[PDB]
Amino acid sequence: KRIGVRLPGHQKRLAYSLLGLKDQV
């Protein structure tokens, strides 16, 4: 159940998630 073992990317969406967690706060 190891978490964080060489992800496929999640880089282009990192930026997006900042969006969904910025305009609100």
From Swiss-Prot:
Mutagenesis / variant outcome for changing G4W: In CTRCT6; reduced protein stability and reduced ability to stimulate cell migration in absence of its ephrin ligand
Induction pattern: Up-regulated by UV irradiation via a TP53-independent, MAPK-dependent mechanism.
Domain of life: Eukaryota
Places the protein is found: Cell membrane; Cell projection, Ruffle membrane; Cell projection, Lamellipodium membrane; Cell junction, Focal adhesion
Post-translational modifications reported in the UniProt record: Autophosphorylates. Phosphorylated on tyrosine upon binding and activation by EFNA1. These phosphorylated residues are critical for recruitment of VAV2 and VAV3 and PI3-kinase p85 subunit which transduce downstream signaling to activate RAC1 GTPase and cell migration.
Tissue expression profile of the protein: Expressed in brain and glioma tissue and glioma cell lines (at protein level). Expressed most highly in tissues that contain a high proportion of epithelial cells, e.g. skin, intestine, lung, and ovary.
Functional summary from the UniProt entry: Receptor tyrosine kinase which binds promiscuously membrane-bound ephrin-A family ligands residing on adjacent cells, leading to contact-dependent bidirectional signaling into neighboring cells. The signaling pathway downstream of the receptor is referred to as forward signaling while the signaling pathway downstream of the ephrin ligand is referred to as reverse signaling. Activated by the ligand ephrin-A1/EFNA1 regulates migration, integrin-mediated adhesion, proliferation and differentiation of cells. (Microbial infection) Acts as a receptor for hepatitis C virus (HCV) in hepatocytes and facilitates its cell entry. Mediates HCV entry by promoting the formation of the CD81-CLDN1 receptor complexes that are essential for HCV entry and by enhancing membrane fusion of cells expressing HCV envelope glycoproteins.
Summary of subunit composition and partner proteins: Homodimer. Interacts with SLA. Interacts (phosphorylated form) with VAV2, VAV3 and PI3-kinase p85 subunit (PIK3R1, PIK3R2 or PIK3R3); critical for the EFNA1-induced activation of RAC1 which stimulates cell migration. Interacts with INPPL1; regulates activated EPHA2 endocytosis and degradation. Interacts (inactivated form) with PTK2/FAK1 and interacts (EFNA1 ligand-activated form) with PTPN11; regulates integrin-mediated adhesion. Interacts with ARHGEF16, DOCK4 and ELMO2; mediates ligand-independent activation of RAC1 which stimulates cell migration. (Microbial infection) Interacts with human herpes virus 8/HHV-8 glycoprotein L/gL and glycoprotein H/gH heterodimer; this interaction triggers EPHA2 phosphorylation and endocytosis, allowing virus entry.
Related illness: Cataract 6, multiple types: An opacification of the crystalline lens of the eye that frequently results in visual impairment or blindness. Opacities vary in morphology, are often confined to a portion of the lens, and may be static or progressive. CTRCT6 includes posterior polar and age-related cortical cataracts, among others. Posterior polar cataract is a subcapsular opacity, usually disk-shaped, located at the back of the lens. Age-related cortical cataract is a developmental punctate opacity restricted to the cortex.
Family of this protein: Belongs to the protein kinase superfamily. Tyr protein kinase family. Ephrin receptor subfamily.
Name this protein carries in UniProt: Ephrin type-A receptor 2
Full protein: residues contained: 945 to 969 of 976
